[PDB]
Write an enzyme that holds these catalytic residues in place. Structure first.
Site, mmCIF file in Angstrom:
data_model
loop_
_atom_site.group_PDB
_atom_site.id
_atom_site.type_symbol
_atom_site.label_atom_id
_atom_site.label_comp_id
_atom_site.label_asym_id
_atom_site.label_seq_id
_atom_site.Cartn_x
_atom_site.Cartn_y
_atom_site.Cartn_z
ATOM 1 C CB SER A 10 11.399 -0.104 4.327
ATOM 2 O OG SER A 10 10.394 -1.083 4.131
ATOM 3 N NE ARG A 11 11.106 -5.639 8.489
ATOM 4 C CZ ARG A 11 10.355 -6.719 8.683
ATOM 5 N NH1 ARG A 11 10.565 -7.499 9.734
ATOM 6 N NH2 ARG A 11 9.393 -7.020 7.822
ATOM 7 C CE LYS A 15 -7.421 -1.515 5.660
ATOM 8 N NZ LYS A 15 -7.618 -2.983 5.691
ATOM 9 C CG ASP A 26 -6.654 -5.871 6.134
ATOM 10 O OD1 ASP A 26 -6.836 -5.584 4.931
ATOM 11 O OD2 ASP A 26 -5.745 -5.360 6.824
ATOM 12 C CB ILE A 34 -0.991 -0.021 1.182
ATOM 13 C CG1 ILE A 34 -2.160 0.922 0.901
ATOM 14 C CG2 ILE A 34 -0.306 0.356 2.491
ATOM 15 C CD1 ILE A 34 -2.762 0.742 -0.476
HETATM 16 N N1 LIG Z 1 -2.973 -4.394 0.561
HETATM 17 C C1 LIG Z 1 -3.898 -3.318 0.322
HETATM 18 O O1 LIG Z 1 -4.442 -3.239 -0.707
HETATM 19 C C2 LIG Z 1 -4.188 -2.256 1.415
HETATM 20 C C3 LIG Z 1 -5.018 -1.217 1.098
HETATM 21 C C4 LIG Z 1 -5.301 -0.268 2.004
HETATM 22 C C5 LIG Z 1 -4.751 -0.350 3.287
HETATM 23 N N2 LIG Z 1 -3.923 -1.390 3.615
HETATM 24 C C6 LIG Z 1 -3.361 -1.426 4.992
HETATM 25 O O2 LIG Z 1 -2.103 -1.053 4.979
HETATM 26 C C7 LIG Z 1 -1.314 -1.970 6.035
HETATM 27 C C8 LIG Z 1 -0.217 -2.758 5.307
HETATM 28 O O3 LIG Z 1 -0.807 -3.298 4.091
HETATM 29 P P1 LIG Z 1 0.164 -4.035 2.963
HETATM 30 O O4 LIG Z 1 -0.669 -4.663 1.920
HETATM 31 O O5 LIG Z 1 1.086 -2.979 2.354
HETATM 32 O O6 LIG Z 1 0.994 -5.193 3.713
HETATM 33 P P2 LIG Z 1 2.614 -5.503 3.452
HETATM 34 O O7 LIG Z 1 3.023 -5.014 2.127
HETATM 35 O O8 LIG Z 1 2.845 -7.042 3.551
HETATM 36 O O9 LIG Z 1 3.455 -4.738 4.636
HETATM 37 C C9 LIG Z 1 4.045 -3.476 4.331
HETATM 38 C C10 LIG Z 1 5.510 -3.512 4.828
HETATM 39 O O10 LIG Z 1 5.568 -3.418 6.380
HETATM 40 C C11 LIG Z 1 6.897 -4.147 6.740
HETATM 41 N N3 LIG Z 1 6.650 -5.266 7.700
HETATM 42 C C12 LIG Z 1 6.100 -6.484 7.749
HETATM 43 N N4 LIG Z 1 6.275 -6.918 9.010
HETATM 44 C C13 LIG Z 1 6.937 -5.949 9.712
HETATM 45 C C14 LIG Z 1 7.361 -5.892 11.032
HETATM 46 N N5 LIG Z 1 7.356 -6.693 12.251
HETATM 47 N N6 LIG Z 1 8.003 -4.806 11.481
HETATM 48 C C15 LIG Z 1 8.241 -3.758 10.642
HETATM 49 N N7 LIG Z 1 7.829 -3.811 9.357
HETATM 50 C C16 LIG Z 1 7.174 -4.922 8.901
HETATM 51 C C17 LIG Z 1 7.333 -4.639 5.636
HETATM 52 O O11 LIG Z 1 8.359 -3.775 5.038
HETATM 53 P P3 LIG Z 1 9.997 -4.199 5.236
HETATM 54 O O12 LIG Z 1 10.122 -5.715 5.237
HETATM 55 O O13 LIG Z 1 10.792 -3.643 4.111
HETATM 56 O O14 LIG Z 1 10.468 -3.619 6.555
HETATM 57 C C18 LIG Z 1 6.045 -4.650 4.602
HETATM 58 O O15 LIG Z 1 6.524 -4.730 3.233
HETATM 59 C C19 LIG Z 1 -2.186 -2.796 6.564
HETATM 60 O O16 LIG Z 1 -2.645 -2.257 7.897
HETATM 61 C C20 LIG Z 1 -3.365 -2.845 5.582
HETATM 62 O O17 LIG Z 1 -4.518 -3.091 6.239
HETATM 63 C C21 LIG Z 1 -3.630 -2.342 2.705
#
Ligand SMILES: NC(=O)c1ccc[n+]([C@@H]2O[C@H](COP(=O)([O-])OP(=O)(O)OC[C@H]3O[C@@H](n4cnc5c(N)ncnc54)[C@H](OP(=O)(O)O)[C@@H]3O)[C@@H](O)[C@H]2O)c1
Ligand SMILES: NC(=O)c1ccc[n+]([C@@H]2O[C@H](COP(=O)([O-])OP(=O)(O)OC[C@H]3O[C@@H](n4cnc5c(N)ncnc54)[C@H](OP(=O)(O)O)[C@@H]3O)[C@@H](O)[C@H]2O)c1
EC number: 1.1.1.376
Lengths: 306, 299
Positions: A34-35, A88, A166, A12
């Site tokens: 970001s890691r 969120k 979610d 996102i």
């Molecule tokens: N997917 C969608 O379409 C969407 C849409 C609207 C809102 N959201 C919201 O946005 C949030 C993340 O969504 P996402 O789809 O982007 O998931 P995601 O890509 O899997 O997570 C985003 C990044 O957070 C880091 N991460 C994972 N575990 C972590 C940990 N313990 N500590 C620190 N960083 C960690 C990772 O970056 P690094 O490994 O590089 O550190 C990950 O690439 C969620 O709350 C979701 O509900 C998602």
């Protein structure tokens, strides 16, 4: 310009946050944490701790990481004196969001719990049309292929990941915005695959304080075209929101809507909140999900395959 | 005095509520509602709506029925302009409680969500002693035998039905808010609520607060809150009747949980205030929301 840092450069963050920030003149993207990723053109850190230590003049942080680490990151950012924007859900628990809000208020900082679907173009037109009328029933259908929206993601299946809630909580964020009266949960059924900890599908039966039934079906087992629909039946006919808030029909007549700009709207609001010296922390969608987990029956289904 | 009605005359209403009301001079018991019970000396009704329609000068009501029927009763009483006192927990869901508090605040009425264990003798002494001190860790041990149906139904709380009493004491004696960091719920395969649970919390200063609840057979029954500080350990035992500080037992008065509740309810009505602490229920909700679930053998 308000100097801004973004934490967790994942799906996102690439799809929505960085484009919206770049087009918002009120913010200057200053740093990212970001890691396993970096953003070209800005200073980059592996973790929020190192970012905060180095970026003493930074004003604000926006968190795009999984909700399970949201509290730790937001607390650290608030303790360093930064305004905080939350994806969120605003937390894995209600207690942590209450603590963050009290802390942000206890530091004079802006805390913003975002609900991007509330900024869909049909939302405020639906709220305005519905404030005057006699609502009879509400039907919610929020179903999409999880593998297309969270490919390779595992945190959605872990405690605090909400599972199908979610995206399902986006529907509740719209419903709690367009309905005039508060909701209370009456029953819930959570359908949990044998190999995960969160539901892949759920049904909710709620009522508002006038007794209006609000029925919701959430499912992450779906084909390639989403069904993100909210239908409000009134004495004046049906208000039908579709395509997650991008499409609106009222009594069968389509309603003209401006283009979708949910995350531009979120960041415009974040900046305005900071300039106002105000916060925006509405946890009612998460409180209803918590009631669903507390009160809802749990049924096992077959393995998802993660 | 304040005119008072009581709804749901079960065993706890007979043992605790009515004696406490009888001895509280601020209230006059005027009416009771109960489907299967009548109370000598006052007017009796079979439901709250009938009581409310007839008792037009009534000032307040105390609701002792289970939470699954209490929300609709609390609504009707607030809409009728009555102050409302609630047995614990204040609702079956958090949304219910939010609705009542908004309703009461809008009519300027007193809403009192009681936690009878918060009025145990050790609670206020423990809170005064801990308010200033450097706390290091908190451990809660709640264990009993459940063999000694609603509790196993969706929303029945399971082991948190009694365990929430210890959480209401914990949240009252500690000076800072708790955040749930990890939880584990142990659910028999034939029920929908946990028979055992472990809570891993931290307060806003990072103090770890651990709680274990077990309803299965194991070692001897126990109810204990131990709070380690730089000045030694504070230990609450016997459901809040017994207190030790740095190894020294503390003299405590007799148990008067419900006389204390009714004295506070009267004081709230006098000052025009409400007292709706949902935090013990919110922590339980967070455990159901955030908790990892583990299956065990059928019950
Ligand atoms: N997917 C969608 O379409 C969407 C849409 C609207 C809102 N959201 C919201 O946005 C949030 C993340 O969504 P996402 O789809 O982007 O998931 P995601 O890509 O899997 O997570 C985003 C990044 O957070 C880091 N991460 C994972 N575990 C972590 C940990 N313990 N500590 C620190 N960083 C960690 C990772 O970056 P690094 O490994 O590089 O550190 C990950 O690439 C969620 O709350 C979701 O509900 C998602
Ligand atoms: O602690 P408790 O004892 O379980 O309180 C239960 C008492 O409140 C009433 N109660 C239980 N279930 C009720 C229900 N669905 N509706 C109305 N009252 C109920 C009952 O009084 P009554 O059965 O006399 O109404 C019962 O004696």
């Amino acid at each position: 310009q308000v100097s801004l840092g973004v934490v967790g450069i994942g799906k996102i963050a690439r799809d929505q946050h960085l484009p919206a920030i770049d087009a918002e003149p009120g913010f200057k993207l200053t740093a990212c944490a970001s890691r396993h990723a970096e953003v070209t053109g800005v200073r980059n850190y592996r973790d929020l701790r190192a970012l905060l230590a180095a970026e003493r003049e930074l004003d604000a942080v926006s968190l795009c990481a999984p909700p399970q680490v949201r509290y730790a990151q937001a607390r650290a950012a608030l303790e360093a004196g930064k305004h905080v924007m939350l994806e969120k859900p605003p937390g894995a628990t209600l207690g942590e969001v209450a603590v963050l809000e009290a802390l942000a208020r206890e530091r004079g900082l802006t805390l913003f719990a975002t609900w991007h679907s509330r900024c869909a173009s049909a939302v405020e037109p639906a709220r305005e049309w519905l404030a005057t009328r006699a609502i009879r029933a509400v039907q919610v259908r929020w179903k999409a292929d999880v593998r297309r929206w969270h490919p390779g993601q595992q945190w959605i299946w872990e405690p605090g990941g909400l599972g199908v809630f979610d995206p399902g909580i986006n529907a509740l964020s719209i419903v709690t915005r367009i309905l005039p009266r508060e909701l209370v949960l009456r029953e819930a059924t959570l359908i949990v695959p044998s190999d995960v900890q969160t539901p892949i599908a759920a049904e909710l039966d709620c009522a508002d304080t006038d007794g209006v039934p609000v029925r919701a079906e959430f499912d992450w087992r779906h084909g390639p075209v989403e069904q993100w629909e909210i239908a409000v039946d009134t004495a004046d006919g049906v208000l039908a929101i579709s395509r997650g808030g991008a499409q609106l029909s009222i009594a069968g007549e389509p309603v003209e809507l401006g283009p979708e700009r949910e995350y531009p709207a979120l960041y415009a609001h974040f900046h305005a909140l900071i300039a106002r010296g105000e916060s925006d922390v509405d946890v009612r969608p998460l409180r209803l999900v918590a009631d669903a987990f507390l009160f809802g029956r749990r049924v096992q289904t077959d393995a998802f395959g993660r």
